[PDB]
């Protein structure tokens, strides 16, 4: 008693972003580049066109 | 007649010409370019003449 007192008021707000973010999954692959520069010589045909 | 080659596409396809397509197809747009110009085995700098 005897006091008044003065009032500001505020707020917080808590929000998670991250545990929606994950990785899916990661994948990867396998490829015979043509450089040329080769000979054939191990076995032969196999993949016709 | 220049006979360009269509190229394939950086991963294995069935679209254009096949290698062996263009084997001989190339092969063929040296001998045009080059018996206008060679007129057998050898080039000419001076240029070919026919008969």
Same mark, same amino acid.
């Given at each position: 008693?005897?006091?008044?007192? %003065?009032?500001?008021?505020?707020?917080?707000?808590?929000?998670?972003? $991250? +545990?929606?973010?994950?990785?899916?999954?990661? %994948?990867?692959?396998?490829?015979?580049?043509?450089?040329?520069?080769? $000979? +054939?010589?191990?076995?032969?045909?196999?993949? %016709?066109? | 007649?220049?006979?360009?080659?269509?190229?394939?596409?950086?991963?294995?396809?069935?679209?254009?010409?096949?290698?062996?397509?263009?084997?001989?197809?190339?092969?063929?747009?040296?001998?045009?370019?080059?018996?206008?110009?060679?007129?057998?085995?050898?080039?000419?700098?001076?240029?070919?003449?026919?008969?």
């Amino acid at each position: 008693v005897g006091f008044g007192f %003065i009032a500001i008021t505020l707020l917080t707000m808590f929000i998670n972003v $991250g +545990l929606t973010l994950k990785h899916t999954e990661t %994948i990867i692959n396998k490829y015979k580049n043509y450089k040329w520069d080769s $000979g +054939l010589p191990t076995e032969y045909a196999d993949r %016709i066109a | 007649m220049k006979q360009n080659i269509n190229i394939g596409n950086v991963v294995d396809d069935g679209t254009g010409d096949y290698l062996r397509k263009g084997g001989i197809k190339i092969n063929e747009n040296f001998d045009e370019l080059y018996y206008e110009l060679g007129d057998g085995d050898v080039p000419y700098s001076a240029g070919a003449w026919k008969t």
